[PDB]
Structure 1
Amino acid sequence: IVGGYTCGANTVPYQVSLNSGYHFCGGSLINSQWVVSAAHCYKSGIQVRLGEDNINVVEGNEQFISASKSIVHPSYNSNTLNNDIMLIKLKSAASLNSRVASISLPTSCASAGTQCLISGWGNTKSSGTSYPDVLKCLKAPILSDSSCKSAYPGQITSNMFCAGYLEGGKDSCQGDSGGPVVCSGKLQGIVSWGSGCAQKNKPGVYTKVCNYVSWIKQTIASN
């Protein structure tokens, strides 16, 4: 997260870290057994880490649970990042408490102009590289579809939306991938892609979760 703020320990209790020997992506806990992340975060041997603040120190509130299965969206296209969404099932149910909690799926899509909360342990520099220890947060508005398409001509599908600041300086970044964009208490987006981070006229592009609720519900009901 570039140009954000320190969230505060366990204030984003649905935020997870995906670990394959190291943190590589974020995700969102949607019930005691399932995590929503980006399909571009797919790999084998995922351990889900819940209740994290400092990802490099065991602070006492963590739950580390191995993934039993990963389900990439059937229409995910890794070239265009269309349908950039994946479900991860935990080997055992998480214990839900104040520090580990699920985030609601949306019933309707979010509105242009709505300020959303984006979070992760990704790069905090727009140029250069610095990774934080503690969870970072950013408040950013959903942009109009026309401004989103103008920013990325020929690349924005109906399964994507832009959020952030066209002046640059504030954005999600590498290492935030798969993490939550929460708007009005619902998981509305997943950190997906963008040209660089926090660049002028290049806002963040996010998977449009409201398009996937049917697929999510059907998949969780059968796996």
Structure 2
Amino acid sequence: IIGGEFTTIENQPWFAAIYRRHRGGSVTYVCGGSLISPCWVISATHCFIDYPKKEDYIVYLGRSRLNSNTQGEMKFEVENLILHKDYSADTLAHHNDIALLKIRSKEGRCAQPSRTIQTIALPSMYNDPQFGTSCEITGFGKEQSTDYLYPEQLKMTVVKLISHRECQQPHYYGSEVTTKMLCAADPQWKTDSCQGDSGGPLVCSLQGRMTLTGIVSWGRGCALKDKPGVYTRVSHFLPWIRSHT
């Protein structure tokens, strides 16, 4: 997250932190995700497509820091790793960038909701907020495009939804943005998602409730003029989500 503010998991208690085990024991951060039911985390396919073996991954819930244990956190194995069969990528855009992880602890349990671990509601079908709606994004991604490190503390910021007409303008993204994507950005381009925020939630207030409207997917640079963040449009994937969960 470029800009924004530091936060703790209580503010975004559906946020999942996904890591990968390496040959030799080291563990590195991969991507974010969102808890949509006790046994299911939703994320982005591009986070896993290089290493699509579920045994490589660890999921934490209730975690506020990248490399420190947070009181109350829970740690899971990945029982199923479900990638979207119509995924594709060009030099910039990722299509159908959505993935499901079924989580299971070493003793065979799913998530126990708590003050630091909660599910996020899915949107109603083809129902998004109007353009200009403020939504929240959350993640452990880079604080500056040029940083080599990720922040140790979770961050969140606010971006505003951009109309599809505006985002497909040539000096934005053209046809790289599809109707299964949403764009969102800051009016001054000063705050944004970045590398390492992929897979995490874009949350908006819809019908009086916080709702998972988007999944961080891609963008050209970070917090660059005329280059919004692009998000998988969750309201267009409900049959896929329901069918694989």
TM over 0.5: yes
Alignment match of 2:135 (pick from 106, 116, 139) = 116
- Name the counterpart of 1:39: 45
Matched with 2:144 is: 125
In the other structure, the counterpart of 1:174 is 195
Q: Secondary structure at the match of 1:106?
A: coil
User: 2:98 matched to 1:85?
Assistant: yes
1:140 aligned partner = 159
1-structure distance, mates of 2:129, 2:84: 21
- Unaligned stretches of 5+ residues in structure 1: none
- Using structure 2 for the length normalisation, give the TM-score: 0.86
Matched, 1:76 2:93: no
Asked whether 1:207 is paired with 2:232, we answer yes
| Residues 34, 9 of structure 1: alpha-carbon distance in 2 compared, 3 angstrom cutoff | closer
Match of residue 11 from structure 1: 11
The partner residue of 1:49 within 49, 60, 73 is 60
The one-letter amino acid of 2:143's match is T
| Alignment deviations for residues 159-211 of structure 1 (CA, whole Å, 9 cap, x no partner) | 11110125322100000000000011110100000001001111101000000
2:112 maps to 1:95: yes
CA distance in 1, matches of 2:216, 2:137: 8
- Provide closer, same or farther for how the CA distance between residues 56 and 128 of structure 1 changes in structure 2, counting only shifts above 3 A: closer
Conservation of the 8 A alpha-carbon contact between 2:9 and 2:15? no
* Cα pair 2:161 2:184 within 8 Å, conserved: yes
Q: Which moved more, 1:24-33 or 1:130-139?
A: 130-139
CA contact (8 A) 2:183 2:231 kept: yes
5+ residue gaps, structure 2, are 21-26
CA contact (8 A) 1:126 1:199 kept: no
Shift of residue 145, structure 1, vs aligned partner: 1.0
Structure 2 distance, partners of 1:67, 1:133, is 24
For 1:193, give the aligned amino acid: W
Matched, 1:60 2:77: no
SS of match in other structure, 2:235: helix
Which residue of the partner structure matches residue 24 of structure 2? none
CA deviations on 1:4-59 (whole Å, 9 max, x unpaired) are: 10123421100011011111100000010000000101132111110000121113
Which sits farther off after the overlay, 57-66 or 73-82?
73-82
SS of match in other structure, 2:237: helix
Aligned residue in 1 for 2:36: 30
Bigger mean CA offset, 143-152 vs 172-181: 143-152
Matched with 2:173 is 152
Helix, strand or coil for the counterpart of 1:40?
A: helix
Note the aligned Cα RMSD (angstroms): 1.3
Mapped partners of 1:9, 1:212: distance in 2: 26
- 2:221 paired residue among 179, 188, 196: 196
Q: What per-residue deviation string (whole Å, max 9, x for no partner) do you get for residues 49-80 of structure 1?
A: 10000121113211010101111112111334
